[PDB]
Write a protein that binds this ligand. Sequence first.
Ligand code: NA
Length: 129
Amino acid sequence: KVFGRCELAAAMKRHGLDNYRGYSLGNWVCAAKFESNFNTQATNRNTDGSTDYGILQINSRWWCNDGRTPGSRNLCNIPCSALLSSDITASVNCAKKIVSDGNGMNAWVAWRNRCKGTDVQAWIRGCRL
Ligand code: NA
């Protein structure tokens, strides 16, 4: 499913991401925009053999099991395919585990290079939250 900007914001807010670990909603919508362009079915393979899945492009090396990433840890205890669902619940639950990790949202390269330090509030403006 391809989410609308405000539709995703509301869905993320309802799942408790607004200000989770101090990161405002704008940060999460911005990350999803540049990671997958709001497409829950987005997949991208990396040179190390791992693959990123879903709206938040969660990596198979440490967070989910896709059956083809040797030495993966599956920290979110879930099949990577579950992260491609129209229901973002799984991606959100795993993201909360990731952001609590230790490096915060810096775990997401697009957020560091394209969202961090910018006016993230702009991503939820005009929305009925
Ligand atoms: Na894994």
